[PDB]
């Protein structure tokens, strides 16, 4: 059993070594000690999981579509391999969501942090939604939505329209409306409102980052009018 300073340190080593599972394990334990994570630790947890969650999602997209493009005992094998990837994926999200339920959200004493972790709960349910069986989908989707909505209300009350967390939340939440709920009307007005409130907000230093989220929002708006 190593202390917080040690695990954080291993986590930074693992990050450089590009061993993200290790990186994740470290930050999991750190979070499990129960103190409110500093910014730097929050960023470390997120990087680690984003990579450990992305390698699977990307794998699933590939195998899922080899399974679709086909039709065979080859198709049973793709399917079984899809299912194997999914179960690794569900595991990673349930670990993340549980870390959010027991630790990150309850302990967040700043709005910015609360919004960030809520957004993250919306993302991790969005991921379990992409891959749901068909019977729990509607339920998973409600969860994602509820968490993004909670995050959304806090970010309107508490943060500047150009804050990159608020804006990233708008982005992810609008992609959820588009890709997951199948609603492009909701996706559009959300992306649009957030983009305009931020523009109107320019009468806010200093994000080259806040602009990046803004370009992503408008790109989506242009891609969704066709």
């Amino acid at each position: 059993g190593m202390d917080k300073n040690e695990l954080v340190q291993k986590a930074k080593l693992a990050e450089q070594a590009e061993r993200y599972d290790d990186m994740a394990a470290c930050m999991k334990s750190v979070t499990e000690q129960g103190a409110e994570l500093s910014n730097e630790e929050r960023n470390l947890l997120s990087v680690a999981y984003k990579n450990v969650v992305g390698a699977r999602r990307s794998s699933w997209r590939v195998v899922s579509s080899i399974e679709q493009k086909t039709e065979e005992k080859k198709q049973q094998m793709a399917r079984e391999y899809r299912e194997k990837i999914e179960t690794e994926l569900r595991d990673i999200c349930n670990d993340v969501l549980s870390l959010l339920e027991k630790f990150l959200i309850p302990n967040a004493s700043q709005a910015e942090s609360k919004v960030f972790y809520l957004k993250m709960k919306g993302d991790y349910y969005r991921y379990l939604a992409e891959v749901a069986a068909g019977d729990d989908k509607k339920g998973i989707v409600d969860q994602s939505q509820q968490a993004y909505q909670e995050a959304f209300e806090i970010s309107k009350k508490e943060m500047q329209p150009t804050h990159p967390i608020r804006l990233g939340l708008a982005l992810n939440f609008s992609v959820f409306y588009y890709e997951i709920l199948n609603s492009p009307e909701k996706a559009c007005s959300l992306a649009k409102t957030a983009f305009d409130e931020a523009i109107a907000e320019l009468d806010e230093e200093s994000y080259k980052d806040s602009t990046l989220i803004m370009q992503l929002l408008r790109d989506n708006l242009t891609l969704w009018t066709s």
Partner: peptide, 10 residues
Amino acid sequence: GXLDXLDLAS
């Protein structure tokens, strides 16, 4: 760097 952490849905 920064935005990498925010897990942007692009």
